[PDB]
Amino acid sequence: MDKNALRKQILQKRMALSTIEKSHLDQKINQKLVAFLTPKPCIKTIALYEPIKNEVTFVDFFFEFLKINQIRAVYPKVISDTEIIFIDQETNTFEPNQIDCFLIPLVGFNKDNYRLGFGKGYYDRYLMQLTRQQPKIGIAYSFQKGDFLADPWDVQLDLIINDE
Ligand SMILES: Nc1ncnc2c1ncn2[C@@H]1O[C@H](COP(=O)(O)OP(=O)(O)O)[C@@H](O)[C@H]1O
Ligand SMILES: [Mg+2]
Incomplete structure (x- = not known):
């Protein structure tokens, strides 16, 4: 229930995933991403992230999809203990509203x-x-679902794409 406690729980579970199990779960999820973006051609700049503690990984055929549809990818960078900004491969900084979609870890x-x-x-x-x-x-x-209550400052998120 408590955020801190829930973090620890899920965190331990995700670090148990098999290298093969995880790669399969990621395949299902990346396929959905491609499925999600296909009928949305107005998304030309998209925010991704760099997989860290066993987070869902963006695979090769996903980056090819973006490459072939000319969709620019931007990544987060921290500047302070509270601020984060997004930049493209050439380190060019993109303002919040220059981005059309956000894939959040x-x-x-x-x-x-x-x-x-x-x-x-x-x-x-x-x-x-x-x-x-x-x-x-x-x-x-899928197993990252948890029963915690949102705080007043929590941005809600439009959708949660998982393996199902
Ligand atoms: N819009 C905001 N303005 C000021 N402080 C914020 C804002 N959003 C979040 N915070 C602060 O950032 C922290 C985020 O906590 P929490 O939501 O539990 O973390 P996380 O999103 O990483 O799970 C809180 O201490 C909160 O007060
Ligand atoms: Mg929060």
Whole structure:
């Protein structure tokens, strides 16, 4: 129930995934991503992230999809203990509303699509700046569902794409 406690739980479970099991779960999920973006050609700049503690991985055929449809990928970079910004491969910084879609990493999400991160709350602060109704999409493994209650500052997220 408690955020901190829930983090620890899920965190331990995700670090148990088999190298083969995980690669399969990631395949199902990446396929959905491609399925999600196909009928949305107005998404030309998209925010991704660099998989860290056994987070869902973006695979090769996903990056090929973006490459072939000319969809630019931007990644997060921290500047302070509270601020995060996004940049493209050539280190060019993209403002919040220059991005059309956000694939957000997470440790947990509940039934109302709220998400749980590592605590600093970078995304809660950042996502609050969006003014173009950009989809806010959490990326996760089915078992990352958890029963915690959202705090007043938590940005809700439009959807949670997982292995199902
Ligand atoms: N928009 C905001 N303005 C000021 N502080 C914020 C804002 N959003 C989040 N925070 C702070 O960031 C921290 C995020 O905590 P929490 O939501 O539990 O983390 P996480 O999103 O990583 O699971 C909280 O201490 C909260 O007060
Ligand atoms: Mg939060």
